[PDB]
Amino acid sequence: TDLIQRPRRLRKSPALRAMFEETTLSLNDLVLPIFVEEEIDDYKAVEAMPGVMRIPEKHLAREIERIANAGIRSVMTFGISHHTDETGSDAWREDGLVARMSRICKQTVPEMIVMSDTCFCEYTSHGHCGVLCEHGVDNDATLENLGKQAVVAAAAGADFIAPSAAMDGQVQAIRQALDAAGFKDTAIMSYSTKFASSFYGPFREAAGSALKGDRKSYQMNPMNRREAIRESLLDEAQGADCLMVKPAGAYLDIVRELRERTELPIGAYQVSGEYAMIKFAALAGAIDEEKVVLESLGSIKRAGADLIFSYFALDLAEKKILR
Amino acid sequence: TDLIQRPRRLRKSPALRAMFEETTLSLNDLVLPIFVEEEIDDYKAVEAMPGVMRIPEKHLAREIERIANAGIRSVMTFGISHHTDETGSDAWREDGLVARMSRICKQTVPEMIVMSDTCFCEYTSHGHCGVLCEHGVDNDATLENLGKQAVVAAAAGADFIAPSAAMDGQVQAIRQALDAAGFKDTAIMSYSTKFASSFYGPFREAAGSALKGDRKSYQMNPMNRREAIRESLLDEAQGADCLMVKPAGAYLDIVRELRERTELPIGAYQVSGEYAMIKFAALAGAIDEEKVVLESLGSIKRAGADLIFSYFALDLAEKKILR
Amino acid sequence: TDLIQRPRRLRKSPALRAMFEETTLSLNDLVLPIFVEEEIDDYKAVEAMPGVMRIPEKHLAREIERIANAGIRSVMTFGISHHTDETGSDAWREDGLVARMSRICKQTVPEMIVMSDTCFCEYTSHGHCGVLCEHGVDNDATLENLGKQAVVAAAAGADFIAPSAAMDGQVQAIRQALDAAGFKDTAIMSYSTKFASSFYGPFREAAGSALKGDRKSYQMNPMNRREAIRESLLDEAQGADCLMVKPAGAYLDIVRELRERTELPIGAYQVSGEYAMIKFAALAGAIDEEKVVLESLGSIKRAGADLIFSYFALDLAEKKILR
Amino acid sequence: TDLIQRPRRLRKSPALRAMFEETTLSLNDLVLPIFVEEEIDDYKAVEAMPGVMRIPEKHLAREIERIANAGIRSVMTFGISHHTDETGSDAWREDGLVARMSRICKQTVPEMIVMSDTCFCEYTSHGHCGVLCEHGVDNDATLENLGKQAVVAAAAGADFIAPSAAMDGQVQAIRQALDAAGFKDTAIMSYSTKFASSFYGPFREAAGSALKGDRKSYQMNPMNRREAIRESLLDEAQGADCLMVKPAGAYLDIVRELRERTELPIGAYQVSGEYAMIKFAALAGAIDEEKVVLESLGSIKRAGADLIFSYFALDLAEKKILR
Amino acid sequence: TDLIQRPRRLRKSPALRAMFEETTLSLNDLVLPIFVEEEIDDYKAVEAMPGVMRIPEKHLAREIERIANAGIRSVMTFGISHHTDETGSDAWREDGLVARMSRICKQTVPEMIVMSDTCFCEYTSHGHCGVLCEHGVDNDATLENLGKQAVVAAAAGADFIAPSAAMDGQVQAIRQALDAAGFKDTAIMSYSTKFASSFYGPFREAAGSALKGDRKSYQMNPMNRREAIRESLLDEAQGADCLMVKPAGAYLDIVRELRERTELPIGAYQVSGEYAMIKFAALAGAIDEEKVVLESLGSIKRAGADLIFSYFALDLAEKKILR
Amino acid sequence: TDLIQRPRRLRKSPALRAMFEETTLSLNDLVLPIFVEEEIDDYKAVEAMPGVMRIPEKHLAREIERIANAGIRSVMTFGISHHTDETGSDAWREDGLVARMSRICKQTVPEMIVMSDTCFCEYTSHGHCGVLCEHGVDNDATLENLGKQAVVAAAAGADFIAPSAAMDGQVQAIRQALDAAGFKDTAIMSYSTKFASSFYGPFREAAGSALKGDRKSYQMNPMNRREAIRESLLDEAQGADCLMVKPAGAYLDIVRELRERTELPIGAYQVSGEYAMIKFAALAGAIDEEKVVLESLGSIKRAGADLIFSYFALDLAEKKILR
Numbered sequence A, B, C, D, E, F: 001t002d003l004i005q006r007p008r009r010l011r012k013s014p015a016l017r018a019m020f021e022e023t024t025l026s027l028n029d030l031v032l033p034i035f036v037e038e039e040i041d042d043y044k045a046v047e048a049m050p051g052v053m054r055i056p057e058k059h060l061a062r063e064i065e066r067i068a069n070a071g072i073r074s075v076m077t078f079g080i081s082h083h084t085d086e087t088g089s090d091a092w093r094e095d096g097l098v099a100r101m102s103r104i105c106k107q108t109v110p111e112m113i114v115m116s117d118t119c120f121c122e123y124t125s126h127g128h129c130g131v132l133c134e135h136g137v138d139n140d141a142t143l144e145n146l147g148k149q150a151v152v153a154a155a156a157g158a159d160f161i162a163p164s165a166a167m168d169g170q171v172q173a174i175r176q177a178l179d180a181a182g183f184k185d186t187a188i189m190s191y192s193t194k195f196a197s198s199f200y201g202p203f204r205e206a207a208g209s210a211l212k213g214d215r216k217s218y219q220m221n222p223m224n225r226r227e228a229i230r231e232s233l234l235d236e237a238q239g240a241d242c243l244m245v246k247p248a249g250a251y252l253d254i255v256r257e258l259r260e261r262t263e264l265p266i267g268a269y270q271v272s273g274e275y276a277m278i279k280f281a282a283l284a285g286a287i288d289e290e291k292v293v294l295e296s297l298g299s300i301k302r303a304g305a306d307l308i309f310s311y312f313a314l315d316l317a318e319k320k321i322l323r
């Protein structure tokens, strides 16, 4: 045949493929989500997320040291509340679970970058991400509370306040609140593009969010690509230090489009449902877990993500699979 | 607070979200991959693909009628061979499994759009997609054979010849051979950007591909986004009627980038590993299968895919979930 | 003051800066240029390149093993000739220095990616990169000879034929000659954009190029950015597998502009003058050598280079500074 | 051979190359950095920067007249302090070294465009670019001081206040301060994109900055190209009259990307380490200093810089190498 | 008022404006059009072009020496014919005026870059730029003759063959004829975008073009900007070494649009009508000639022209106004 | 010859050329500049602008009726002052020449769109466009006065206030001033991109501006294309209703670049020097005035101008050359 162009020439050997690989994945690209349950004794297994367990608050010092020894540079904290109410007020109490998870992490490992999930669905009796109303989740009532929670977590040592409530103006609210309390240097990792996904079931079981309905009046429609970009750019305008796309696995088109529309770092969340789909397919012997995990995380990097939130990070770190 | 812009305004009710949904998915967007096994009597369950089964050649006429009655408009045929050899020559036999699958489908439902998968990994003793040589898979020898296969599948009635061998210049070779044989109107559905993915294990089980090594010397590197675009644009230059990204699920950044680089239709293959990942977490109770399938297929459409190859297509049709 | 945007927030600690670093450099990005001198016994120090030495052909098998063991994946071969003449014909001798360098490397480390520098300035009595004529360097006569050289270097095992003669149509000539001789799978690493730079003095000393005038009638003008892009895009049109910008150091605007104009891999040559500039200020105590080398190579990667030709590569490998 | 396109046609002679040269370099493109040491008698040689010497304040009138007679249109002043303290308060004293270097230059040569380096690393006991804190260099404490120093240098006659502290909001601070003191016409040359480079060693020896640690908590990461663009555009937003990339030699990709993102003039700093690398390689006889200097400065122009800060400017001017 | 942005800041002095000037004009940018009349003894003044005169062929050797000594690097030759006929055949006579003008210039100043105007309007009895037929000017018959003219001007030493006949495919015809005759290195300066302008009256007077009608059936419509770009891009596709916009003065939007659509060098012809307009208002005392000429030529450079054909070039050179 | 593409096909006849002409010029595209001298009796001829005469204020009613009867839709007024002082205060007197020229025009012809030139160079003793200072023309002292003049001309009936002072923030100043006085509906035609051209000599003689020096500290440098765009976009930001490029003839590249950077209407001024160059070349019989005038104005339209200020408009209108 007559072909000047033969893409296969650079695919002949492992060495050639290595030399021409366009995207790299390292441990530094990973942020590890940790679930911490207050007022409890033993680690609790999360059924829907094989390998994942609620860390007892009294064992957090031990765990964050373990995580840090594995090479993990960062964690995103999620608390399981034993003090849920109507407005999730435990979250903004100077000594509530939110403040303490941060405090225990920063005090045990000063160099650990601690990102504090910032919401109310794990602390409200109804399970919704804010103050409920005859209306639904009240946007501006919630903004006030997010700002209050932001200040106590910032005071507790959190490096990033990561608003995941999907409230309009959330970044501005929190930016205004941190600044006024003297936390002008505390960064905001905004879950800027957060879809009303059906992939969060395993996470709600693990973080114990008591929601019976859905989050469609605040988390955005999965189908809306132009809206997804607008969501994140409104947060860049508001001062966010880092932007994010969640879920990440089935939204790589969003990640890539966003990368082309901002100079800001972009995080991407490999959600619980993705973790779950890989784990159960591997358990059924249908796929090779490690190859599938590396290809998955690699694609997220390829699409333009600077940071990836992944429940596989520790195992990848300890088993020296990523360095 | 004072916010003029409130994305949440159009999220208040199901009616508002329906009005403002940017992407829609119909039954028409789906192409159904079918496994046909010659010389057998009972349908065989594919263990790695819960719900999928090999159709006995003797029952193909009944199954294609069933699919057509469900409202499925197109299928992609894959055969399980009982006559494999070194070069997979049964594939270009005027009456081999490949020609017969097309013949039966088109004779049974003349309006059925039949896409014939065009390779050899299912017909070779070594399980590689072409002629093995001291070299590895010999590109040009395989081009010769792919052309011969093309003419007999077209001769049997295939509407599209779909090369999945990942050989350079495969679209040009198939186009010349078809035109020369008087099949200038037969279309080419090129598996233009086809990654050396770790997500095809379930498929190889279902199709009986006898491969011990890998396809890394022809299928392309998962990490190479620039190369991915170049792979499809080369096929556009050689005459493909339709391009394709495979896998789809973890490659929607690629689908989006390609959509913006061509005016040609783009197919996306929701591969066996993606199907198994959904099926197995649904069976373990971790996710809602239907919600996850529709969100996954919807994402593929949102990223820019015009057609989606999906194993869930017949259930979606029969359960009237998509019309 | 009141600033919402504070770039300094992600600069506070080594961990934060590591997380947000946009570019990374690995050992894999580097290609090692090697000088091999036939008919000699002792390694010769190149005075202008502190630390570099000509490898005796008799010791090449030992040095290529040493480089391969350091983890270097690829080399670019340069010979010092003891059999120079008017047309540099030893370069296309089935058993000349050029063929032998490749033969030895590939025989010794089969997995070594061997790029054979393809020119004549090291084999001609006049030191010009081709056939001298009343005219100057005769483009088309040199094209003929470059093709012949290509086939014998491919015949000896070179993985890439790297034309550095700066002759028009050199990639097309080399591609036709290779294909015709049955080397359709041999790749071309074109020195596509190669400037008539004043930074090659150390290299000419090390390679023994016997040139009294300059190369301004073939190598291109350092000031011509539009022409630079056009030079590489022409080579893309002629089939090059990889393009290149040489020198790299003072031409990262060119690397960036080319990166945005092609999907092809781009190499960048950190030339001898750049190496000498770093080596000599490091020896005078003016800078920290290691910090400067890594920042320089990192910049080349940041600008868009996929591969970097660098004389510092073996020290970087052995001192485990890059992996 | 058959080539319609022959790039070499316009390279045949010096006249042709001259006619088609795309980029030009003149003396007007150069700004000369001068080091002035107070309370001293003799010129002090800078070991790390051969040819460069600290000018005794009492000899500044003589030197700026010499510089101006050579054709140099502009200088950037750097003072060596004999009055260093905790906050570098000498810099904002109406008669401190900063104010006097400007005053002596503008009064001796009224047409000389004087740019005043605006920072504190040459005036602080610790050597850091601002007010130190338990925290590190205090951003907003430093902004106040930069504004105060800006007003006295502006009052002393400086044409450009050139903030090189790498503090967020620095341009706004200084713009606000000059305006309020009635210096609304005084321009700001912002070191808008200033990297935490390893190429400043020779400069710190010459300007005597007493820093033991590093500037990584304020000067930006060398590897971050998207961040580099954002840095400069934030300064355009803040009112800067001219933008700048420093270092310039190994950041030509940054210079070019920035040129494409703003209508503003862009300066580029050929730093001390670059000056040093060229001087020591030339001293070792490895390169031709003049050819290498002109090619270096030419590339900076080629990449998009309107002005170039260069320690070679005077010699280039006196030796009538550039006009 | 409160304005952060004050463009006036960099306009305060001649030194500041010199520093920030974005475009420069040198003697090197200019090409001098020369009129040579065979069989005459005295230089003839062109009334419509104050200052321009026809050079007697007998004095051409003296004038080309004069131009070369002024520092002019290139000329465009135009002959006044005493041997005109129906097809302008003296133009392709091995020893006709066209060949002789080149011969004399190149023999006298070998380094002179000689561009030979390539047409027939100066050699035909009817004054049209080619072969007249029942049809009008016959495109393909004129292509034949333009090729023959090309080879004899190249044979005489012309560095560039400049077709100004406005015939379709003229660059391809001239390129084939040159290559075939062994002139593969002769360049083509195509008058690629050449408008059917009303500004050539002075030129026709000076060149003696005997035309009674117009050139509207070959030269293009002044109003057609899309067509203008298409005209030059077609010549790029046919191999031109350099493109051109003629006239220049009232077409700088075209120059700018073309600059952004090609990487090729672009010439711009400051035509006779533009020269006469400047000369006559300068003579009537309405404008300052020198200031207007430099501003006009500067504008042409600012718009993107690499070379400018200008009748003012020798005065500019001799009066040392441009170097 | 073999040419699929023949641009000449659509040039064969006047009908074809007419059908495919891309740009049109009509009378509606023209605004006519008128000079009105107060306290005088007879029309005064402008020597430098043949055909142009100062209209005696007492004859303005007659002239604007004549102009309006010719089909002219608009005029730009310029007054010749008999009451010049230090600040040009006649311009903001409720009954000064500025207010009266507008009043007489709008009252005689209510439908006439009257644009009022808004500056001080025709009313200041020194001839500069504003309040002089030890500094030069005081920007903000001038802004106050421009606002005051804007209000009286707006009150006098002017439809457009056209600031031609080249003061920073001029549009904002005037927008603020008109709004506060209740002239929120009065439009601003900003001479947004106004170069320090050498083409205004004839205009200064006609409008009698007493300037001995130059306007280079406020009108912008002719060579600065990026600055030219920034000038106009700052005015769009400030609220200008229409933008403008002056001069227009030699700045068609600017006009085209601006057209691509804004949705705003763009005016272009065919200045006095252009008018003068065409008139004197025509008088000398060197060019055809009408063909040259139509081609000139046509090019300005072609480049992107919506409106053209032209001294030829009335003659073009009366002679029914444009309709």
Ligand SMILES: *[C@H](CCC(=O)O)CC[C@@H](*)CCC(=O)O
Pocket (backbone or CB within 6 Å): B164, B191, B194, B199, B200, B201, B202, B203, B204, B209, B215, B246, B269, B270, B271, B272, B273
């Ligand atoms: C290409 C890849 C199959 C393989 O490599 O085995 C042709 C079939 C694509 C679908 C595979 C799947 O669904 O996993």
Ligand SMILES: *[C@H](CCC(=O)O)CC[C@@H](*)CCC(=O)O
Pocket (backbone or CB within 6 Å): C164, C191, C194, C199, C200, C201, C202, C203, C204, C209, C215, C246, C269, C270, C271, C272, C273
């Ligand atoms: C091209 C230029 C070499 C020369 O002109 O002598 C091939 C080698 C590139 C590397 C030269 C270096 O490292 O200086």
Ligand SMILES: *[C@H](CCC(=O)O)CC[C@@H](*)CCC(=O)O
Pocket (backbone or CB within 6 Å): E164, E191, E194, E199, E200, E201, E202, E203, E204, E209, E215, E246, E269, E270, E271, E272, E273
């Ligand atoms: C093309 C047009 C000449 C014509 O049509 O007479 C070749 C010469 C261009 C320069 C003409 C001028 O300077 O007016």
Ligand SMILES: *[C@H](CCC(=O)O)CC[C@H](*)CCC(=O)O
Pocket (backbone or CB within 6 Å): A164, A191, A194, A199, A200, A201, A202, A203, A204, A209, A215, A246, A269, A270, A271, A272, A273
């Ligand atoms: C976003 C929404 C979670 C929810 O429960 O709605 C904040 C946490 C994201 C992680 C979800 C996951 O991993 O599935």
Ligand SMILES: *[C@H](CCC(=O)O)CC[C@H](*)CCC(=O)O
Pocket (backbone or CB within 6 Å): D164, D191, D194, D199, D200, D201, D202, D203, D204, D209, D215, D246, D269, D270, D271, D272, D273
């Ligand atoms: C920027 C930072 C200098 C430093 O010492 O950190 C201000 C001066 C730039 C010149 C540095 C050089 O020339 O090396």
Ligand SMILES: *[C@H](CCC(=O)O)CC[C@H](*)CCC(=O)O
Pocket (backbone or CB within 6 Å): F164, F191, F194, F199, F200, F201, F202, F203, F204, F209, F215, F246, F269, F270, F271, F272, F273
């Ligand atoms: C702009 C500047 C005129 C000046 O005299 O500086 C306002 C009027 C423009 C018309 C000038 C002309 O027609 O030459």
Ligand SMILES: [Mg+2]
Pocket (backbone or CB within 6 Å): A166, A167, A168, A169, A192, A231, A234, A235, B007
């Ligand atoms: Mg939001």
Ligand SMILES: [Mg+2]
Pocket (backbone or CB within 6 Å): A007, B166, B167, B168, B169, B192, B231, B234
């Ligand atoms: Mg392919």
Ligand SMILES: [Mg+2]
Pocket (backbone or CB within 6 Å): C166, C167, C168, C169, C192, C231, C234, D007
């Ligand atoms: Mg080339």
Ligand SMILES: [Mg+2]
Pocket (backbone or CB within 6 Å): C007, D166, D167, D168, D169, D192, D231, D234, D235
């Ligand atoms: Mg900054």
Ligand SMILES: [Mg+2]
Pocket (backbone or CB within 6 Å): E166, E167, E168, E169, E192, E231, E234, F007
């Ligand atoms: Mg043409």
Ligand SMILES: [Mg+2]
Pocket (backbone or CB within 6 Å): E007, F166, F167, F168, F169, F192, F231, F234, F235
């Ligand atoms: Mg302005």
Ligand SMILES: [Zn+2]
Pocket (backbone or CB within 6 Å): A119, A120, A121, A122, A128, A129, A164, A165
């Ligand atoms: Zn929540």
Ligand SMILES: [Zn+2]
Pocket (backbone or CB within 6 Å): B119, B120, B121, B122, B128, B129, B164, B165
């Ligand atoms: Zn296959």
Ligand SMILES: [Zn+2]
Pocket (backbone or CB within 6 Å): C119, C120, C121, C122, C128, C129, C164, C165
């Ligand atoms: Zn060479």
Ligand SMILES: [Zn+2]
Pocket (backbone or CB within 6 Å): D119, D120, D121, D122, D128, D129, D164, D165
């Ligand atoms: Zn500093």
